[PDB]
Structures are given as structure tokens and as C-alpha cells.
Nucleic acid binder design. Structure first.
Length: 726
RNA sequence: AAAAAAAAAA
């Protein structure tokens, strides 16, 4: 990195790049070996430049405790290679499972989009969007190499990529990788299976599959189901938590408790899937041409070298298991699990939980898959056989030791047959999920999710006390260490939190920032913006308030990829959860009791807007399909007529004296609109009140809840907005 | 200490 910032070295390497390749332009060889030789000559040149600058300036198989550096090499290497070398040869048996069920088929245009030749725009975007301060596959290189030498490799990489077009093979240096062993959180180091494989590959290799990932990233939503939320941009991890928690609330209210909840976690699923399976599934869903050709060469014979205690252990062929840390690998992880997800979904012998008209049966993540079952006498047994059959074709062995379950039964005699037969660790109190605890009882959801939470900072704040640093150095780590983690809890679990709860949370922080001393500056002044002299002190009371309103956005957009919002129980007339925000309010209809995470949002949604002195039921950002127009008898087809034309807001449609007539294309639309609809709609905005309500400039608050579809920093806008009003 | 989750911290 330091050598990469030298102007003389930069010019020398620019000259070497310019007059190196055009010295042996021979047709006898290929471009991959020339590429590797260019890497080697770059390594030699950097070695020479560094020299010039320096001149100028655990338990074994028997269970015994072993500490010998030579002995441990023979154990972990054998254990890793034993699992990695086991490649399934039952190719004919493998295809039978795939033909049993159905997988999506990509349209030719999408395949052509994946088969589209790499342009000069993808190269610049990926290299620009390359995070720094990281370590790739060694190569004697670093990440800053391609972020500084962009100009000479912008056309050159296409030439390197053009070689793949006529060959479909990868360079020998592309296959190398560096698996880094890091311990799992809160696990003993004595067991050889408690380490995490972190394989770092070449930046050039890391680039290559990224477009392969990026090309399928634009099509991943069509491929996999919406149930999986792992590593899918536009989808958040807490989706399952809210989805899952609603089930226990349903199970608690349900008098007939005979359903079972299991959190199936797999032991190192990142490395125990079969390359033949993942290659043929990629063939089975319509992918072919270059995409099938290039993906075959990527995993034709991948290998990785182990590094431990400063030893460059020799590499070995990864016969099975996708490479860890590859950006494309998680996308492939979903697909191999996707057919698994469909297999359980399409298995009608095992039934899912029917929440009204919504069918909820299972959920996925990276490793912590959860399946909801009822009548475990048959359904649970039917679950095991499919996984073993999937394991028989993929090596997907479920970690029954580390995976718990939740049993809800009314007869103790029936319960005895579960632990006796089902080998799952039936935990009757709580289970682990990404740091959250799905309590058996909803009344205990507050206790086991926040009482451990409040004491978590109690000893955490009991550590950063003796550091000789200023009071300014206390608030920043609060926003860095504890603040990011807590909002995960509110986002996953927005229960009505008593004011007493925030007392300990605030007071613990208060003694931390001043180091067990009285406040030197006013809290209100310090809570203001930097412009007014403040530091923007975190306010968890509003952060909880903001996070309760964070989910208020999803009702407006009503994306079909979110199902958890429809899981709330309702013993009365069906879903209205789409026509609530920015719509006419329904009278003589109040939610509560069974509803836990929706009514509180509405109670908090109305509270904030009333303080703003705003009418939320009629806004410029009102949806065209809002119930305000559905109050009277209207034709559903009529909304579809202008859905393709304007589609977004009633305001753009026209109001006042501009009934569906404000823009030239509307003149070509009114003919399509039914004439009984015109008289119905011409009376809608005739009233003066209806005009002023919409004919107004939208404020900042309504902006974020309509625009800003890339909902990544919704907290920042809402919390800042709540700071000003409150 | 990598793919992806995130608070923006400017």
C-alpha cells in the first residue's frame, strides 16, 4: 500500500505495463499464461523496488490434548481435506431429484443479458465499488493495486476477458485461495471443527465472479423465493424474526397447541455442498451458453492453501464445497437451498401453517433455516427424509446437536414420543437466532429480549472506564458499539416498552459519557445538531419511536416480496393493511389484543403526524389505488387504465379543475377512461376542500415515506426528522 | 477477517 503511493514507482510500473505486453505478442501461447507471467514480473519489480527503497532509506482424534506445531498440521489438514475431498459421484441419482420437482426457467432475454459480453461500464463500476483496507488472495498484492492502476487495465481486462470468450477457461493463478481460520463466537478452541473457513481469493478473481453475481443479482429475485432473506439486497435479516415471532403469537392464542417450531442450523453448510449438484441445478433452470460454460471452469478444479502460525501449507483440491468469501458464492448458496426450499414446499405430505388465506410454512437464512410444522408425528418425520435425500445428493448434513426446537403440546403422553424419536434438542424456554430469543410465551418476549439486553451494556460499560480519553471519546463508541446492535432488537422486536425500561438505558449511558460524573453541558444543547453546537446525542426513546415508524413505509409500497406483514391474526373482516397509510381511515374499526406489532405502529404513526399538524389521509403522495377512490362503487379496470400511464400519485392525475387533464398524454387517456367514471371522478375534486388538501407542496416528512425506495438508511431520515419536531 | 447484513460519520 505504501509502495503503491510512490510517484516514481507508479510511473515505473506504468512504463512496465506499457512496454511489457507488447514484447512477446505471440500466437503460440495464450492470454492466461501471459497474464500470470505479467503478475510474476510485477511481483519481481515490486520486490526490486522495495529492496531499492530499503537500501536508500486443540485435541487429536484420540481426544488427547496436543500443542505440538508439527502434529496439529497433520490433524486439521486431514480433517479439512477429508470433508473437502468427498465428492458425490451419483450423477444419475442426482438428476432424478431435480426432475421430481419444478424450478424456474429464465427467459432467453435474461439469458442473453447474462450472456451479454462484458462492457466498459461494468469494469469501472465494480473497481470503483471495491471496498478498501482488506486482504485478498495473496498474489504478493493488495486491494489498492487495481484501484490505482485502473487506466492501463480498463481496456486490458476486456482483452483478458476476451480470451475467456474463445476458451471458456480460467488462469491457473485464478484458482488459488487462502482459507483463514477464525474461531466461531463463543466456542471452545479445543475442537478442530470450531474454526471458520475464510478463503481470500484474487482481486482479479474476486472481480470476475462479481459480474457473474451482479448479472444474476439483477435476476436473483425472479430465481429464488421471497422467503430467503440472506444476502439479498432490498431484503433485511429481521424479516424472518418478525415473520417467526408472529407464529408463536398465533400459537399462543391458538387453543389447540399441537404445532412444533424447529430452527434447523447446518454445520458448515458453506463447505458441504457438492459441485456436481450446484453445476447441474444451474443447468436445470435454463442457464446455459457462457454462464454455464464460465461457471463450470470456475469450479473445474478449485484449490486453496491453508495458512496457520506463519506456515504456507500446501494447497489441495476442493472436490466439494463452495469457496467461502466469494461474492458469487452466497448467490449460489440460495439456489442449492432453493430447490431444497421448494422440495419441502411442494411436499404436500407435510403441511404448513395456514394463517387465514396466507400460507406460512418455512423460512430461510444463510445457515439458520427455520421450518414451521404441525402434527409432528408425521410432519416432522417427513421433514427428515427429504433432507437426508437432499444430503444423499448434496452432503447437506443438519447439525442436530447445535439446532434446537420449540414444542407446543397439550398431552404429555404425546410429548414423550417426540424426544424419544426426534433427535432434536427440545428447548422449552428459548432458542438462539442472530442474538434474539424467541420466547415460548409472548408475555415473556419483553423479559427475555430486553432484560438480558439492558444488562449487556451494564458490563460492557464496565470495561471502557479506565481509558485516559476525553468525554468526546465516549459518545462516538456508543454510536459504534452498542447503538448499531440495539436497533436490531427494536427493528426485530417493537413491543410497547415502558418508560421505566429507557431509564436504565439512558442512565447507564449518562454515567458512561461523563465517566461517572455530573453533566458539564446541557443535554438538550448537546442533543442538537452540530450547526447549533450540539453533538446529536442518541435518543433511544425516539430511536424506538422512529423504528416503530420505520416499518410504516412497507404498508405504503405494499411490495409483494414482504409476507410477514400479512401474518398478524384477524378474527374479523380481512386485510386492510395496504389502505392505512396515506389513505382514508376506516371508522368503527380498531386493532389491538391479538395484534402486537401493527397496532402500535399505527398508534405511533398517528401520534407523530398529529404533532406535525398534518392531515395524513389526503396527501400529494396518495396512491391512485387508495381507498379514498374505492369508497364509492368504481370499476377495478378503470384504475388499471391509468395505472400504466401515471400510476404513482393522485396528484399527478389532476385535481381542482384539472380532472384527468393536466398533461398532453392525459388527453389521449380520457377516452380510455369510462364515461361513468368521469362523472364519478369529476365530483371527487369539485369540492374546494378536496383541492387544497392535495394542491400543496409535500413536506419533508411525506417525502421519505413515498420516494426513497432504496430503504437502507430510513432510520437516519426519520430519527433526524423526529429530532426536529420533538 | 472475506461475501452480506448498519447504523452515516461527512
Amino acid at each position: 500500500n505504501l509502495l503503491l503511493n510512490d510517484y516514481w514507482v507508479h510511473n515505473e510500473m506504468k512504463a512496465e505495463i506499457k512496454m511489457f505486453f507488447e514484447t512477446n505478442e505471440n500466437k503460440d501461447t495464450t492470454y492466461q499464461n501471459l497474464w500470470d507471467a505479467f503478475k510474476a514480473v510485477c511481483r519481481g519489480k515490486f520486490i526490486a523496488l522495495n529492496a531499492y527503497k530499503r537500501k536508500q532509506e486443540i485435541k487429536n482424534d484420540k481426544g488427547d490434548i496436543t500443542t505440538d506445531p508439527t502434529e496439529i498440521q497433520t490433524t486439521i489438514r486431514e480433517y479439512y481435506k477429508h470433508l473437502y475431498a468427498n465428492k458425490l459421484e451419483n450423477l444419475e441419482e442426482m438428476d432424478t431429484f431435480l426432475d421430481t420437482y419444478t424450478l424456474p426457467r429464465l427467459n432467453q432475454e435474461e439469458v442473453e443479458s447474462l450472456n451479454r459480453p462484458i462492457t466498459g461500464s461494468e469494469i469501472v463500476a465494480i473497481i470503483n465499488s471495491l471496498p478498501t483496507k482488506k486482504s485478498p488472495g495473496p498474489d504478493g498484492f493488495t486491494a489498492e493495486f487495481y484501484q490505482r492502476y485502473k487506466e492501463e487495465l480498463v481496456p486490458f481486462l476486456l482483452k483478458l476477458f476476451q480470451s475467456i470468450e474463445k476458451e471458456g477457461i480460467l488462469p491457473n493463478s485464478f484458482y488459488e485461495a487462502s482459507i483463514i481460520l477464525i474461531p466461531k463466537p463463543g466456542r471452545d478452541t479445543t475442537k478442530k471443527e470450531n474454526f471458520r473457513p475464510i478463503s481470500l481469493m484474487n482481486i482479479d478473481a474476486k472481480i470476475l465472479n462479481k459480474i457473474l453475481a451482479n448479472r444474476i443479482q439483477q435476476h436473483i429475485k425472479k430465481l429464488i423465493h421471497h422467503d430467503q432473506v440472506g444476502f439479498i439486497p432490498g431484503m433485511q435479516g429481521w424479516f424472518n424474526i418478525r415473520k417467526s415471532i408472529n407464529v408463536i403469537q398465533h400459537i399462543n392464542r391458538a387453543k389447540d397447541k399441537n404445532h412444533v417450531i424447529i430452527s434447523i442450523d447446518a454445520e458448515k453448510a458453506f463447505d458441504k455442498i457438492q459441485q456436481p449438484f450446484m453445476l447441474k441445478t444451474l443447468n436445470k433452470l435454463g442457464i446455459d451458453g457462457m454462464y454455464l460454460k464460465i461457471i463450470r471452469a470456475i469450479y473445474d478444479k478449485p484449490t486453496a492453501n491453508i495458512i496457520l502460525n506463519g506456515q504456507k501449507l500446501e494447497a489441495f483440491p476442493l472436490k466439494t464445497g463452495t469457496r467461502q468469501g466469494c461474492p458469487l458464492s452466497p448467490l449460489l448458496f440460495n439456489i442449492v437451498l432453493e430447490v431444497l426450499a421448494r422440495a419441502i414446499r411442494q411436499e404436500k405430505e407435510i403441511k404448513g401453517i395456514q394463517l387465514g388465506k396466507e400460507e406460512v410454512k418455512l423460512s430461510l437464512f444463510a445457515d439458520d433455516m427455520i421450518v414451521y410444522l404441525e402434527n409432528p408425528i408425521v410432519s416432522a418425520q417427513n421433514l427428515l427424509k427429504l433432507i437426508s435425500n437432499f444430503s444423499k445428493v448434496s452432503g447437506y448434513k443438519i447439525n442436530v446437536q447445535k439446532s434446537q426446537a420449540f414444542l407446543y403440546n397439550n398431552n404429555r403422553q404425546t410429548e414423550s414420543q417426540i424426544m424419544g424419536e426426534l433427535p432434536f434438542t427440545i428447548a422449552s424456554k428459548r432458542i438462539k437466532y442472530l442474538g434474539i430469543q424467541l420466547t415460548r410465551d409472548v408475555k415473556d418476549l419483553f423479559k427475555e429480549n430486553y432484560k438480558p439486553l439492558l444488562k449487556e451494556i451494564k458490563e460492557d460499560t464496565n470495561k471502557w472506564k479506565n481509558i485516559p480519553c476525553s468525554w468526546v471519546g465516549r459518545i462516538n463508541i456508543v454510536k459504534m458499539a452498542i447503538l448499531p446492535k440495539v436497533i436490531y432488537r427494536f427493528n426485530a422486536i417493537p413491543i410497547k416498552l415502558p418508560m421505566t425500561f429507557f431509564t436504565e438505558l439512558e442512565k447507564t449511558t449518562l454515567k458512561f459519557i461523563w465517566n461517572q460524573k455530573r453533566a458539564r453541558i446541557a443535554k438538550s444543547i448537546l442533543s442538537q445538531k452540530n450547526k447549533a453546537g450540539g453533538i446529536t446525542l442518541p435518543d433511544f426513546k425516539l430511536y424506538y419511536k422512529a423504528t416503530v415508524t420505520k416499518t410504516a413505509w412497507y404498508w405504503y409500497q405494499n411490495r409483494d416480496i414482504d409476507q410477514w406483514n400479512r401474518t398478524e391474526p384477524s378474527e374479523i373482516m380481512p386485510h386492510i393493511y395496504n389502505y392505512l397509510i396515506f389513505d382514508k381511515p376506516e371508522k368503527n374499526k380498531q386493532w389491538g389484543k391479538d395484534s402486537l406489532l401493527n397496532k402500535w405502529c399505527w398508534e405511533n404513526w398517528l401520534a407523530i403526524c398529529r404533532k406535525l399538524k398534518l392531515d395524513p389521509f389526503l396527501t400529494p403522495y396518495t396512491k391512485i389505488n387508495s381507498r379514498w377512490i374505492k369508497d364509492l362503487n368504481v370499476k377495478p379496470k378503470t384504475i388499471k387504465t391509468l395505472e400504466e400511464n401515471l400510476g404513482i400519485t393522485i396528484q399527478d392525475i389532476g385535481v381542482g379543475k384539472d380532472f384527468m387533464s393536466k398533461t398532453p398524454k392525459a388527453m389521449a387517456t380520457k377516452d380510455k377512461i369510462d364515461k361513468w367514471d368521469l362523472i364519478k371522478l369529476k365530483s371527487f375534486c369539485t369540492a374546494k376542500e378536496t383541492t387544497i388538501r392535495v394542491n400543496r407542496q409535500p413536506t419533508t416528512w411525506e417525502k421519505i415515506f413515498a420516494t426513497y425506495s432504496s430503504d437502507k438508511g430510513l432510520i437516519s431520515r426519520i430519527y433526524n426528522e423526529l429530532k426536529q419536531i420533538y
